[PDB]
Write an enzyme that holds these catalytic residues in place. Structure first.
Site, mmCIF file in Angstrom:
data_model
loop_
_atom_site.group_PDB
_atom_site.id
_atom_site.type_symbol
_atom_site.label_atom_id
_atom_site.label_comp_id
_atom_site.label_asym_id
_atom_site.label_seq_id
_atom_site.Cartn_x
_atom_site.Cartn_y
_atom_site.Cartn_z
ATOM 1 N N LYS A 86 55.502 9.370 29.560
ATOM 2 C CA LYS A 86 56.314 9.837 30.677
ATOM 3 C C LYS A 86 57.714 9.829 30.098
ATOM 4 O O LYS A 86 58.163 8.803 29.583
ATOM 5 C CB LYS A 86 56.292 8.915 31.889
ATOM 6 N N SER B 162 56.337 15.745 36.645
ATOM 7 C CA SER B 162 57.636 15.187 37.026
ATOM 8 C C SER B 162 58.188 15.854 38.286
ATOM 9 O O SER B 162 59.395 16.077 38.427
ATOM 10 C CB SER B 162 58.658 15.306 35.889
ATOM 11 N N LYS C 113 58.635 6.962 37.590
ATOM 12 C CA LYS C 113 57.457 7.459 38.285
ATOM 13 C C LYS C 113 56.161 6.752 37.904
ATOM 14 O O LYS C 113 55.214 6.724 38.689
ATOM 15 C CB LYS C 113 57.345 8.973 38.086
ATOM 16 N N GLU D 106 65.160 10.687 44.175
ATOM 17 C CA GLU D 106 65.368 11.843 43.314
ATOM 18 C C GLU D 106 66.243 12.771 44.155
ATOM 19 O O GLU D 106 66.054 12.867 45.368
ATOM 20 C CB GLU D 106 64.037 12.538 42.994
ATOM 21 N N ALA E 126 65.252 12.230 31.631
ATOM 22 C CA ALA E 126 66.561 12.685 31.164
ATOM 23 C C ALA E 126 67.568 12.488 32.288
ATOM 24 O O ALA E 126 67.201 12.515 33.456
ATOM 25 C CB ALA E 126 66.494 14.158 30.765
ATOM 26 N N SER F 180 63.249 9.685 35.125
ATOM 27 C CA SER F 180 61.889 9.989 35.557
ATOM 28 C C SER F 180 60.804 9.028 35.078
ATOM 29 O O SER F 180 59.669 9.096 35.554
ATOM 30 C CB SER F 180 61.507 11.429 35.170
#
Ligand SMILES: OC[C@H]1O[C@H](O[C@H]2[C@H](O)[C@@H](O)[C@H](OCCCCCCC3CCCCC3)O[C@@H]2CO)[C@H](O)[C@@H](O)[C@@H]1O
Length: 265
Positions: A209, A105, A48, A141, A212, A45
């Protein structure tokens, strides 16, 4: 806590995984700590932030507007969309999508934005445009978090990510307003920000930010510094460890502790 470099090593020993780390002066780009800085780690993540940097670039160019309302459908939603699932009837502005992608997120918000910049290939091209010839996004994603062993897809290196972040936030490649905007989104992270502040000593600035992935993949790109200033960029990635989330969180916090206790280097 022990010295930063020794704590990092201790974390690898205790986690049985690879740790990648960079501590860099935000204003100058001076590298203070570098461990496996040129080794590849899944971005997860943390991508982003770069994604929205590319979005802001389009806004600066006049090819996008943070105000532009994007309408989407339930069928466009992927796993975990805390914000986006709430606006199927009224849509969300491009600016709102970046806030949701970075501060919450939100995964569907990220995909929606990713589309506008040309998908994974388009964001990668953007990275190449700002001089990052290492970082690469290949998937959307949530497949981009797979973290398969030896898989080069959706990876960055601690050195590349730190340099890119500094470029987005300070190199004046983005307009002044855009740089300030990207910074504020990181300041507003609701996923890890509050928790981190709850354990940081008074006087320490935090913007971030986190991410995982599978096989223990874990990571954080952050701005940290005493006297309430974003003095340094700290990028930490973990991979290939069977440790619990709790322990991976603890090890990263431990590296942070070593930095805090031995800040003047
Ligand atoms: O002398 C330095 C300090 O030592 C302690 O601070 C502790 C704190 O009580 C603990 O909660 C934290 O662990 C948390 C560290 C931050 C966790 C996130 C780290 C992230 C943020 C940036 C990217 C790298 C990782 O360690 C520090 C340093 O020993 C004292 O409580 C404090 O009064 C004193 O000012």
């Amino acid at each position: 806590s022990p010295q930063p470099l020794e704590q990092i090593k201790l974390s690898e020993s205790q986690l049985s995984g690879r740790v990648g780390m960079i501590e860099m002066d935000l204003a100058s780009g001076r590298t203070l700590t570098a461990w496996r800085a040129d080794e590849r780690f899944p971005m997860m993540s943390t991508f982003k932030v770069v994604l929205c940097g590319a979005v802001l670039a389009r806004v600066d160019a006049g090819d996008e507007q943070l105000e532009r309302k994007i309408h989407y459908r339930q069928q466009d939603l992927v796993d975990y969309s805390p914000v986006s699932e709430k606006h199927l009837a009224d849509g969300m502005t491009v600016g709102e999508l970046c806030a949701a992608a970075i501060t919450m997120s939100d995964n569907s918000a990220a995909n929606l934005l990713l589309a506008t910049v040309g998908g994974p290939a388009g964001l990668t091209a953007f990275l190449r445009q700002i001089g990052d010839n290492v970082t690469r996004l290949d998937r959307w994603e949530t497949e981009l978090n797979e973290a398969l062993p030896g898989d080069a897809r959706d990876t960055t290196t601690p050195a590349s990510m730190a340099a890119t972040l500094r470029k987005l936030l300070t190199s004046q490649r983005l307009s002044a307003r855009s740089q300030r905007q990207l910074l504020q989104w990181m300041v507003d992270d609701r996923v890890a920000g509050p928790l981190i502040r709850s354990v940081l000593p008074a006087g320490w600035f935090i913007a971030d930010k986190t991410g995982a992935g599978e096989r223990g993949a874990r990571g954080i790109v952050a701005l940290l510094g005493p006297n309430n200033k974003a003095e340094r960029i700290v990028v930490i990635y973990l991979r290939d460890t069977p440790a619990s989330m709790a322990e991976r969180n603890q090890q990263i916090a431990g590296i942070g502790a070593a930095l805090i206790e031995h800040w003047q280097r």
